Amino acid sequence: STGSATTTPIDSLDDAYITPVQIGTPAQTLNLDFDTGSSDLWVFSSETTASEVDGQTIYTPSKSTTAKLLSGATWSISYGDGSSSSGDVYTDTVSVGGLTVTGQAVESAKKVSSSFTEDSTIDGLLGLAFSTLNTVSPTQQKTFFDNAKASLDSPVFTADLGYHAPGTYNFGFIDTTAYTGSITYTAVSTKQGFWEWTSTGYAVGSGTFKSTSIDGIADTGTTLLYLPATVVSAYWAQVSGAKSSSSVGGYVFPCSATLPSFTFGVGSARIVIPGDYIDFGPISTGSSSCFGGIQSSAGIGINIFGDVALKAAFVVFNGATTPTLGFASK
Numbered sequence: 001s002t003g004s005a006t007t008t009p010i011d012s013l014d015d016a017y018i019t020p021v022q023i024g025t026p027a028q029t030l031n032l033d034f035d036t037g038s039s040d041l042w043v044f045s046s047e048t049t050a051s052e053v054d055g056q057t058i059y060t061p062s063k064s065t066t067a068k069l070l071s072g073a074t075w076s077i078s079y080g081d082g083s084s085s086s087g088d089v090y091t092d093t094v095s096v097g098g099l100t101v102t103g104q105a106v107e108s109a110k111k112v113s114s115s116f117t118e119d120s121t122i123d124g125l126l127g128l129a130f131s132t133l134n135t136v137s138p139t140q141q142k143t144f145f146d147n148a149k150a151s152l153d154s155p156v157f158t159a160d161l162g163y164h165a166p167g168t169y170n171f172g173f174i175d176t177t178a179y180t181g182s183i184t185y186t187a188v189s190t191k192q193g194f195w196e197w198t199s200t201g202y203a204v205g206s207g208t209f210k211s212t213s214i215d216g217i218a219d220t221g222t223t224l225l226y227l228p229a230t231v232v233s234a235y236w237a238q239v240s241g242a243k244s245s246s247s248v249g250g251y252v253f254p255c256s257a258t259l260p261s262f263t264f265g266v267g268s269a270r271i272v273i274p275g276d277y278i279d280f281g282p283i284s285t286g287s288s289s290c291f292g293g294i295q296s297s298a299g300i301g302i303n304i305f306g307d308v309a310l311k312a313a314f315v316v317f318n319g320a321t322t323p324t325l326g327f328a329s330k
Helices: 144-151 231-237
Strands: 003-009 017-023 028-035 041-043 070-076 085-095 101-114 122-127 156-160 167-171 184-187 196-204 210-218 225-227 244-245 250-254 261-265 269-273 277-280 287-292 294-296 303-305 314-318 325-329
Touching: 003 085, 028 101, 070 101, 101 144, 184 196, 210 225, 225 287, 231 250, 231 294, 250 294, 261 325
Parallel strands: 028 122, 041 101, 210 303, 225 294
Antiparallel strands: 003 017, 003 167, 017 028, 017 085, 041 122, 070 085, 085 101, 156 167, 156 314, 184 325, 196 210, 196 261, 225 303, 244 250, 250 287, 261 269, 277 287, 314 325
């Protein structure tokens, strides 16, 4: 089997992407944030504290003839950005882009933190990291991909995120029309539960390529590109007036600037992030200070190849017995 679904930016800055997902019988369609950095499929629901729902579409398990309470199961998750959610668990039928999993764990939120409430466009998350990170207790549950894998034509999914435009998540096949040149594959460590890999280096604008190993994670659920302070300083040094602002929480730059591109290495291959992908707009409405899309990972404890990086590529998440990652230009 295969599936193919369009993923759409939630706003004009590409802060996140939402993909429609069918849950239950009859289908209830919710727009979920596909997150290769986590491993829980959780939704706003009829069980979510009323004051914490503000415009989201909810899953109502009592209206699904295929929903079953997973007795005794609870979940609770905290994300890198400080947000969190928790609740109980149902199993139900879940379909993405025509690909159907029966008996998928659907984690129903009883509580969500303010950032979730305040984002009316995201109805929940669909985790696509390794199932070892799933938070369900006392019986850990499998991700949608893990459940689908054996049925797929090939044990893969691909992320093709757009810049200020829709893109695609495919399951079970590689669309050879969706990229240019070849796909370069690179090794993955699953030791921390992530799609963790090692970039071979970087360049800033038309500058020379610096060969250096950068371990990090391919994370569709993180907006920005978080890299070591040395790398980030080298980038922003090429933008007149750019500076790190403790009050704002990262590098800012004059909105009048033209940003240089940023290149990262995948083996001997190179992925070029255009300068415009690195512009996240005014820090506050009407400001002429703009927020940068490349930020330091210092104090995160890990480098993160988030949407800023991934949207410059066609990305293969290869879930074969030994997983790997593939990157192509597009």
